[PDB]
């Protein structure tokens, strides 16, 4: 969803502060008949304060929408203040307020950061500094990339000298849980950004092949491998293309870190090679199944 599904600006104290939405304001807006002209304008149930613009109607699970988010749950507010603390840590301009709020993000990445910030054993719980950084990134407002120390989370099912492997817990999620029940996915963050020895690299690869032999080793182009089962590489291919599709829109500095050919599954390396290098849909797609 867009950042504007969760909060709304407020030019107060001579700059912009972000206030979270009352799940009932939203709920009120969802029943409103509004003018075509204000569909992108912040809604006002008079009872429950401000709501998001009624265009984000489908991003919210309703009676006739199972495809959106569960905005009524405790999880909702938690995420919303998460985002709110982060944005308010930036001082955002009139210039940016629109793209910042229209910024398409991962609910699920954010819910996992909630779960991290809150469990006392995690440093996130203790270092606010670190928390912000993890949020700013998942929100796409930092130069930096996801290291292990700043990772979305889940259960570490393997830890290395230069990797940490997370099991993604998306079935049990509360704000926007994975509705498919087969689902199994892991991601592998790099402990640091630095160069990685053949000892470490081979170890990781040894792990991946004994333990997770049934899994495709892929990447979405940031600093880390998602570890998907072989039946998903498909949906994964199309999605990764579409975001490189919006290169036809500069400011999306499309640094596709096609990581170490040693870990990345060979066909993904083939596929990603073509696309990152200007090729069309089909000469890319064909590399993947050959």
Curated annotation (Swiss-Prot):
> For this protein, what is any one GO molecular function term?
metal ion binding
Signal peptide per UniProt: none
The prosthetic group or cofactor this protein requires is: Mg(2+)
Catalytic residues (positions): 224 (for ntpase and rtpase activities)
Q: How does it assemble?
A: Homooctamer. Interacts with VP1; this interaction is weak. Interacts with NSP5; this interaction leads to up-regulation of NSP5 phosphorylation and formation of viral factories. Interacts with host DCP1A, DCP1B, DDX6, EDC4 and EIF2S1/eIF2-alpha; these interactions are probably part of the sequestration of some host SGs and PBs proteins in viral factories.
Instruction: State what this protein does.
Output: Participates in replication and packaging of the viral genome. Plays a crucial role, together with NSP5, in the formation of virus factories (viroplasms), which are large inclusions in the host cytoplasm where replication intermediates are assembled and viral RNA replication takes place. Displays ssRNA binding, NTPase, RNA triphosphatase (RTPase) and ATP-independent helix-unwinding activities. The unwinding activity may prepare and organize plus-strand RNAs for packaging and replication by removing interfering secondary structures.
In Swiss-Prot or TrEMBL terms, this protein is called Non-structural protein 2
Q: Which organism is it from?
A: Rotavirus A (strain RVA/SA11-Ramig/G3P[X])
Q: What is the lineage of its organism?
A: Viruses, Riboviria, Orthornavirae, Duplornaviricota, Resentoviricetes
């Amino acid at each position: 969803a867009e950042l504007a599904c969760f909060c709304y600006p407020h030019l107060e104290n001579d700059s912009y502060k972000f206030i979270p939405f009352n799940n009932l304001a939203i709920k009120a807006m969802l029943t409103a008949k509004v003018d075509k002209k204000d569909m992108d304008k912040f809604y006002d149930s008079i009872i429950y304060g401000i709501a998001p613009p009624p265009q984000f109607k489908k991003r919210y699970n309703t009676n006739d929408n199972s495809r959106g988010m569960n905005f009524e749950t405790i999880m909702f507010t938690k995420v919303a203040m998460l985002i709110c603390e982060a944005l308010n840590s930036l001082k955002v301009t009139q210039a940016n307020v629109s793209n910042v709020l229209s910024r398409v993000v991962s609910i699920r990445h954010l819910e996992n950061l909630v779960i991290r910030k809150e469990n006392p054993q995690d440093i996130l719980f203790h270092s606010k500094d670190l928390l912000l950084k993890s949020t700013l990134i998942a929100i796409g407002q930092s130069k930096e990339i996801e290291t292990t120390i700043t990772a979305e989370g889940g259960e570490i099912v393997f830890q290395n000298a230069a990797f940490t492997m997370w099991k993604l817990t998306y079935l049990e999620h509360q704000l926007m849980p994975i509705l498919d029940q087969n689902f199994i996915e892991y991601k592998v963050t790099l402990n640091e950004d630095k160069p990685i020895s053949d000892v470490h690299v081979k170890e990781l690869v040894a792990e991946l092949r004994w333990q997770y032999n049934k899994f495709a080793v892929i990447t979405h182009g940031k600093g880390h491998y998602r570890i998907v089962k072989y039946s998903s590489v498909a949906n994964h291919a199309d999605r990764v293309y579409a975001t490189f599709k919006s290169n036809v829109k500069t400011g999306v500095n499309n640094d596709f870190n096609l990581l170490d050919q040693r870990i990345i599954w060979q066909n993904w390396y083939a596929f990603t090679s073509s696309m990152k290098q200007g090729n069309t849909l089909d000469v890319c797609k064909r590399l993947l199944f050959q």
